[PDB]
């Protein structure tokens, strides 16, 4: 099989004795990318002010969040230092080498600055066809308000400011597409219902005003236990993080 084809081997020395993927020297093993994809990373983070929400905030949504195992399309700007120099996390880098998947994701919503209550819904039959989130007053009514019968969780910030949920796989097909394009008209159906786990909506439930500094919502994510990165195609070409901010100014 050509991908691993090694003809006419010329090997001067014997192989190097094993450490069981680090288990001999350190106390743990490192043999599967799936394990690393289960270590949380930043999915999206933003600040929301009263001006971003509807004039009359009738317990409306704060964030409409599309759920992709390969993460969102990052926007590196002066306001987002992480995406600019850290770029994409490990999970989007891992995901890029595989075509398909079939599992769920585990999220962690951290809301700071708000004394009210937060509601979270999962819309598996309504996933976005764009790789960017929708904020506040730009969210359509169909999603801006709590829908019935969807799997949900409602949490008071007074008890805990961190929400922990696991989003399931509810798709009509065999696989979900990894690394999908937002420019897709020839296969809209694939992009619409065979790509994302369904939008996750994060809203507020109370009359408390938002501080002038605003509230900050940080969504971390990771792969669930039933998740699988399925068919290994090539890796795409990469960029180097050390080529964002140069070492010509070692401290900056």
């Amino acid at each position: 099989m050509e991908r691993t084809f090694t003809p006419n081997v010329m090997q001067p020395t014997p192989l190097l004795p094993t450490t069981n993927d680090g288990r001999v020297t350190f106390g743990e093993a490192f043999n599967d990318l799936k394990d690393l994809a289960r270590r949380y990373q930043l999915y999206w983070e933003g600040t929301i002010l009263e001006g971003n929400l509807r004039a009359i905030r009738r317990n409306s949504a704060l964030v409409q969040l599309p759920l992709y195992p390969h993460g969102l399309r990052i926007q590196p700007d002066v306001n987002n230092p992480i995406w600019n120099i850290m770029r994409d996390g490990h999970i989007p880098v891992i995901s890029s080498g595989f075509r398909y998947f079939r599992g769920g994701l585990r999220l962690r919503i951290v809301v700071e600055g708000l004394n009210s209550c937060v509601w979270v819904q999962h819309h598996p039959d309504r996933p976005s066809i764009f790789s960017r989130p929708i904020i506040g007053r730009y969210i359509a009514a169909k999603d801006a308000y709590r829908n019935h019968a969807y799997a949900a969780y409602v949490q008071n910030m007074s008890v805990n400011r961190t929400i922990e949920v696991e989003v399931p796989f509810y798709q009509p097909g065999l696989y979900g597409m990894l690394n999908a394009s937002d420019n897709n008209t020839a296969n809209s159906f694939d992009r619409l219902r065979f790509t994302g786990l369904g939008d996750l909506l994060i809203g507020i439930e109370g009359e408390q005003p938002i501080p002038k500094e605003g509230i900050e919502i940080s969504v971390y994510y990771s792969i669930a236990d039933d998740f699988s990165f399925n068919i290994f195609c090539g890796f795409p070409p990469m960029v180097y993080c050390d080529e964002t901010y140069s070492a010509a100014t070692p401290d900056l």
Binding site: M1, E2, R3, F5, L174, I231
Partner: protein, 131 residues
């Protein structure tokens, strides 16, 4: 060449087609091979199979690459698969038709389809080139 006949040519037969090869191949498999089980959950209508038609090795495109248009990464073929192959018989207006090729004749009367594929690439150079 050491015989009256040139030498022995290996043979590969499928349906009523016979392919000859003379050298050792380069091979690979896109993904793990398997027998499908969830296709039965998609359609209650009995799935028809036409092995003598479909299991037939069929000839695709010939593409001509020259020295003057052969650069690193030059794409001799970039085709949607198997779309481009099954739809290779077009009319005056470049509209495909499944009606003439026996291998594709089941595609005309069925709405949904599935199969595994194999692709052979044949080049017959002389003894004095490199690439």
């Amino acid at each position: 060449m050491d015989r009256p006949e040139g030498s022995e040519e290996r043979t590969v037969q499928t349906s009523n087609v016979v392919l000859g090869e003379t050298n050792i191949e380069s091979q690979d498999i896109a993904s793990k091979e398997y027998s499908p089980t969830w296709d039965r959950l998609a359609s209650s209508e009995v799935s028809d199979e036409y092995p003598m038609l479909t299991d037939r090795w069929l000839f695709w495109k010939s593409v001509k690459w020259e020295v003057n248009d052969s650069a690193f990464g030059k794409m001799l073929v970039q085709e949607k698969f198997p779309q481009s192959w099954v739809q290779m018989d077009v009319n005056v207006n470049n509209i495909p038709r499944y009606t003439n090729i026996p291998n594709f004749i089941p595609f005309n009367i069925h709405q949904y389809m599935r199969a595994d594929f194999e692709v052979k690439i044949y080049v017959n150079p002389n003894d004095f080139v490199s690439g």
